[PDB]
Each structure stands twice: as C-alpha cells, then as structure tokens.
C-alpha cells in the first residue's frame, strides 16, 4: 500500500503520456539510468516506470496486485512504487539497467490529473454519505476504513455521470444528437449497446458521424479492435483525447446531453 491514495514522490508526474515522459527524459539529458514515474493511463491503480538507457526510452507497467502491493509483470512485489524505485536503484533484477538519477518535476510543475482523478474523492464521499447516511468524522472514518474497495467501485461507475456518456441510446439517436449544433471536428459521445460492457464511440469527422465498436475482452479490458486496452471508459476517453492512435481524428468536445 502507498502511504496516501495519491503518489507524492518528487519524480512522479501523474498522468503524463509516454511522449511527455520521453520529452522530460530528453530535457533531463537522456543519461543512462535517468528515470521518472507516471500514473498508468490504461491499468487502474497502476504506474509506469520510464527510464533512459542507450539513448532510448524503456517503459514498464507497474500493476497494483489484488493485495495492494505493486509489481512489474513477473517481478517481486513491493509495498509502494517508492520501494520499487529504491530497490531497482540497488539491483537491476530484470530492468534494462540500474536506476541512477531521478528526473524531478521542474519547480512549480505539479503531477498531472485527469477528469476522473479530479472527481474521484468527491464521488466516493457522495456515495458513502448517501448509502450509509453519515456526516462529519463518521463519514471520514467510513471512507478510510473501506478506501480501497470504494476506489474500485467509483472507478467502475464514474463514467455514467461524465458528460460524454449518453447511456443506452440507439445508433440513430446518437447520429441525431451529435449533428445538432456546431459541427466541431472531434465532437464525440460513448453509448452502451447491451448491459454486458459492449459500447460504441461516436465521433464527428468533416460533418459525418463515425461509430467505433468498444468491447470487453475475457480479462475485463475495454478496447476498439486492434486498439490499446483499458480497465475503464474514462481511461479510453483520456487516451483518444490526446492522440487519434488509429481513429480518423482526436476526440475534442464531449457532445452535451438533452
């Protein structure tokens, strides 16, 4: 377990992209064993270790295991990503090199957060208050006592309340609602197709509405066919809002509901 729900290391950048992490490693000299930590953009509660070696960047996913420990795939578990980084500063233990030099956040640069991370604590507070009828200290104690389970639940449901999620509406309703108003390129929504985690991404491109399939594979991972895999729709939306990555264009303005 981390000491707090949020990471606070001086070399943690929050939810920067692979590309932003690489830009920071170049800014820091791309010296062998230069590294930073970012929040995983496709593994819930996960991190990514971005380290320079051979004037190349190497990126490792650090998963949160079921017991609240952290591990790169097939590696020893660690209490926290802080412990993982300090350990890999002493033993390579499978990494391309020893971690030698943390690249720290430049002065006054804060860890990046997404829409979900900015809503998360308040969504959990509202859920415990309304489910259990609690106030003040009692509310605060209840949040803390089940923090890990509450974080998993709010993550799985938070999309329902977000502006781009229109629930169970038809293909036809989606084309109609996307084509209302300014035909801003990248205007988008996500709709449900069934109750079994199948969805569609509806995207405005040169006055035409495209539909991409979003499917839950047998692991519980959401993806567009041949696309990056995510634990949540809010992760998927954050990714395709940064770069097209196979879409005809990047997602921009969420289509307003009615």
């Amino acid at each position: 377990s981390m000491a707090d729900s949020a990471n606070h290391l001086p070399f943690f950048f929050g939810n920067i992209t692979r590309e932003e992490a690489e830009d920071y490693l170049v800014q820091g000299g791309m010296s062998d064993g230069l590294y930073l930590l970012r929040q995983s953009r496709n593994y819930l509660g996960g991190f990514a270790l971005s380290v320079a070696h051979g004037r190349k960047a190497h990126h490792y996913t650090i998963e949160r295991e079921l017991n609240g420990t952290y591990a790169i795939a097939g590696g020893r578990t660690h209490a926290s990503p802080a412990d993982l980084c300090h350990y890999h500063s002493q033993e390579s233990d499978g990494l391309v090199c020893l971690l030698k030099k943390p690249f720290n956040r430049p002065q006054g640069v804060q860890p990046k957060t997404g829409p979900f991370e900015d809503l998360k604590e308040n969504l959990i507070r509202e859920y415990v208050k309304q489910t259990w009828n609690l106030q003040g200290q009692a509310l605060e104690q209840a949040i803390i006592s089940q923090k890990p389970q509450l974080e998993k639940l709010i993550a799985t449901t938070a999309h329902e309340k977000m502006p781009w999620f229109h629930g169970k509406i038809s293909r036809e309703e989606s084309e109609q609602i996307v084509l209302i108003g300014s035909k801003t390129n990248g205007k988008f929504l996500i709709r449900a197709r069934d109750n079994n985690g199948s969805y569609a991404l509806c995207l405005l491109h040169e006055g035409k509405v495209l539909h991409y399939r979003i499917d839950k594979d047998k692991t519980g991972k959401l993806s567009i066919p041949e696309g990056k895999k995510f634990d949540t729709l809010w992760q998927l939306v954050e990714h395709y809002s940064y770069k097209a990555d196979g879409l005809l264009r990047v997602l921009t303005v969420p289509c307003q509901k009615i």
């Binding site: 190497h58 490792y60 499978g94 990494l95 991409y212 770069k243 990555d245 196979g246 005809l248």
Partner: peptide
C-alpha cells in the same frame, strides 16, 4: 462499412523484465 476500423495504431512497445 457500418463501424469504422482503426487505421495504423502508433508503435507503443512496453518493456519486460529480462536477463
């Protein structure tokens, strides 16, 4: 075609523990 296919997804290689 009714659902758009993805075009050429960018290279996005994750490193693994090795040696």
């Amino acid at each position: 075609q009714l659902y758009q296919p993805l075009k050429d997804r960018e290279d996005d290689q994750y490193s693994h523990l090795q040696g």
